[PDB]
Amino acid sequence: AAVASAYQRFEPRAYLRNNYAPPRGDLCNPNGVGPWKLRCLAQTFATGEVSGRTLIDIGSGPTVYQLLSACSHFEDITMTDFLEVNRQELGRWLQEEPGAFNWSMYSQHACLIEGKGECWQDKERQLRARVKRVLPIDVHQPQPLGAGSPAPLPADALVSAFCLEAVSPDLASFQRALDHITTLLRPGGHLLLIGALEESWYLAGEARLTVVPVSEEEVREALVRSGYKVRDLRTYIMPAHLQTGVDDVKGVFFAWAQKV
């Protein structure tokens, strides 16, 4: 409701520089949040238990790092966002247009930790080839992609990072949004959920956005109540040097959940 108007002033390039340029975007320190997120995803896909033909990324924003390890396990990938200015920034990177964001530091680091000898250009090439479409989405609607969408449903897997808690006024609408995106997932399919812990605001240029502050326990309970078995749930505590003025995040959680 009120989240809708706040996001109308969201600046993609301000969000990217706040969260994916140095210091947070410096991947040289292995104790940083960037390396921790990439490791969570790489370790999960390296188990081999998360696989299929189609995958959907919920609330992509203007970022692609969350699919770097995913893309070699799913041949049809749908990226999504509420904002068209983000879908446009995504398109600029998928089509190698001018002004695209330079994700190569993240592709590089994903290649390092996967340990398959893959060069980073091949990783990026493969991600662009498998992202078939970039669609609008609204996780508040009981059909987040609308009716009859160009997206093959139900998907084998969902990935969502920093969306649900950032679009939800409180714990209850957070739980509904989770219920809503769960309708997109085949039984036995997997959810990879990344989110901020105990956060209440972040800035994106002129936009100041409200976040529901959630704990690890509340994330687990909410995944159960939506019908998931929780395969893994991990926490990163935000160090002082990554506490800038752009938000009040206290930590990051990673959940690997399987729909029963």
Ligand X SMILES: Nc1ncnc2c1ncn2[C@@H]1O[C@H](CN(CCCC[C@H]2CNCc3c2ccc(Cl)c3Cl)CC[C@H](N)C(=O)O)[C@@H](O)[C@H]1O
Cβ 5 to its own copies, closest distance in Å?
Answer: 30
Confirm or reject binding of residue 258 to ligand SAH (CB under 6 A): no
Confirm or reject binding of residue 82 to ligand X (CB under 6 A): yes
Work out whether the CA dihedral 210, 244, 255, 51 comes out positive or negative. positive
Confirm or reject binding of residue 106 to ligand SAH (CB under 6 A): no
Confirm or reject binding of residue 33 to ligand X (CB under 6 A): yes
Structure tokens at 76: 């049809």
- In the bound state with ligand X, the residue whose beta carbon lies nearer, of 54 and 66, is 66
Residue type, 1: A
- In the bound state with ligand SAH, the residue whose beta carbon lies nearer, of 99 and 115, is 99
SS3 for 3-69 is HHHHHHHECHHHHHHHHCCCCCCCCCCCCCHHHHHHHHHHHHHHCCCCCCCEEEEECCCCCCHHHCC
Residue 185 interacts with which of its own copies, ligand SAH, ligand X, none, CB < 5 to 8 Å by class:
none
Annotation-wise, does 65 bind a ligand? yes
Contact with ligand SAH (CB under 6 A) among 56, 68, 135, 166: 166
Annotation-wise, does 86 bind a ligand? yes
Q: Do residues 257 and 227 touch, judged by C-beta distance below 8 A? A: no
The residue count for binding ligand X (CB under 6 A) is 29
CA–CA separation, 128 and 114 (whole Å): 19
The residue count for binding ligand SAH (CB under 6 A) is 22
**Which one, of 226, 234, 236, 235, lies nearest residue 259 by Cα?**
226
- In the bound state with its own copies, the residue whose beta carbon lies nearer, of 134 and 197, is 197
Cβ 157 to its own copies, closest distance in Å?
Answer: 24
> Residue 6 contacts by C-beta under 8 Å, 6 or more apart in sequence?
207, 208, 209, 210
Annotation-wise, does 207 bind a ligand? no
User: What are the residues binding ligand SAH (CB under 6 A)?
Assistant: 3, 7, 10, 19, 59-61, 63, 66, 81-83, 86, 137-140, 161-163, 166-167
